[PDB]
Amino acid sequence: GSPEYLSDEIFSAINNNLPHAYFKNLLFRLVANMDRSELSDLGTLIKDNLKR
Amino acid sequence: SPEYLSDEIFSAINNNLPHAYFKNLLFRLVANMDRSELSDLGTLIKDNLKR
Amino acid sequence: PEYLSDEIFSAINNNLPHAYFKNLLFRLVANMDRSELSDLGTLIKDNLKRD
Amino acid sequence: GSPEYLSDEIFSAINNNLPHAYFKNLLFRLVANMDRSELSDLGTLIKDNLKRD
């Protein structure tokens, strides 16, 4: 029975106290752990994000 | 200050973060990046898509 | 971190000298201060350590 | 026979007209395709280069 969502302000405030580099060591290790489908899912989200 | 974080210490890091942090995490960070940043990320993705 | 496309990486390198590709790594690691050195140092370890 | 050695000045010259992001990109394409053997090689060598001040 534990909420699956992190409010913005709490997100923004946790990230303000993480080792800066973590935000690439994450994506690299994330993108590295993806498969084909995970990749187009990500490519497309990226695609959208640039058009918006 | 390292540019890369070691495995077991990055686990130390993640380990003291509630799951909520990671839920739709990929989404969020992607939500914040730059044009060249994400432009960069798109290329890698398109690369491994063929790589 | 700028990403260099699989096609922008290939292009360049084929226009690089065959001799340029000779033990680049010592030159590089030579042209790689201790800071860098340790970063990539750690990484190889991790890369290796994996059971 | 083709050369297989480049003077420190040609190398360096050839590096300055190289995109700033060539080496990091280059550095990990090598790494990524190294087996346990070469991995262990470069560590030992990074180690060696650690204290060869």
Swiss-Prot record, chain B:
Subcellular location: Nucleus
Residues of the full protein shown: 222 to 272 of 779
UniProt subunit comment: Interacts with DCD53 and SKP1. Component of the SCF(CDC4) complex containing CDC53, SKP1, RBX1 and CDC4. CDC34. Interacts with CDC6 and CIC1. Interacts with SIC1; the interaction involves a SIC1 double phosphorylated motif (degron). Homodimerizes; the dimerization increases SIC1 ubiquitination in vitro.
Name of the molecule in the record: Cell division control protein 4
Source organism per UniProt: Saccharomyces cerevisiae (strain ATCC 204508 / S288c)
Source organism superkingdom: Eukaryota
Annotated function: Substrate recognition component of a SCF (SKP1-CUL1-F-box protein) E3 ubiquitin-protein ligase complex which mediates the ubiquitination and subsequent proteasomal degradation of target proteins. Recognizes and binds to phosphorylated target proteins. Directs ubiquitination of the phosphorylated CDK inhibitor SIC1. Involved in the degradation of CDC6 together with CDC34/UBC3 and CDC53, and in restricting the degradation of FAR1 to the nucleus. Is essential for initiation of DNA replication and separation of the spindle pole bodies to form the poles of the mitotic spindle.
Disulphide bond pairs: none
